[PDB]
């Protein structure tokens, strides 16, 4: 699993440092094992339509 | 590896 360029969020979500929205608080979180397993479930569901 | 937004969450304990 590859990740996007880190500079995308720095210039867009953290464009203003004196404000805090729903996106900015969770742009700094990290996933656990079960959450990665759920991501794998989502991708498996996508790759078999219907 | 840390972000300033997680600092508030861990700090508010």
């Amino acid at each position: 699993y590859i990740a996007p360029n880190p500079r995308i969020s720095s210039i867009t979500l953290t464009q203003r440092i004196t404000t805090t929205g729903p996106f900015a608080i969770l742009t700094g979180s990290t996933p656990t094992a079960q959450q990665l397993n759920d991501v794998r479930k989502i991708y498996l569901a996508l790759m078999f339509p219907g | 590896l840390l972000s300033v937004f997680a600092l508030q969450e861990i700090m508010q304990k």
Binding site: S10 | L2, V4, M11
Partner: protein, 48 residues
Amino acid sequence: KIVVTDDAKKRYKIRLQRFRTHVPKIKVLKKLIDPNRMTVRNLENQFV
């Protein structure tokens, strides 16, 4: 000249060092500093 090179690994290393310097892991427990200071917030995307 104080030069900072575009190589990502170096910028990450200075970023980590500055984050340690401003907010160290040791007195973040004892002194219970507030994370709302303008400098510590500015540290988030200062050298990205």
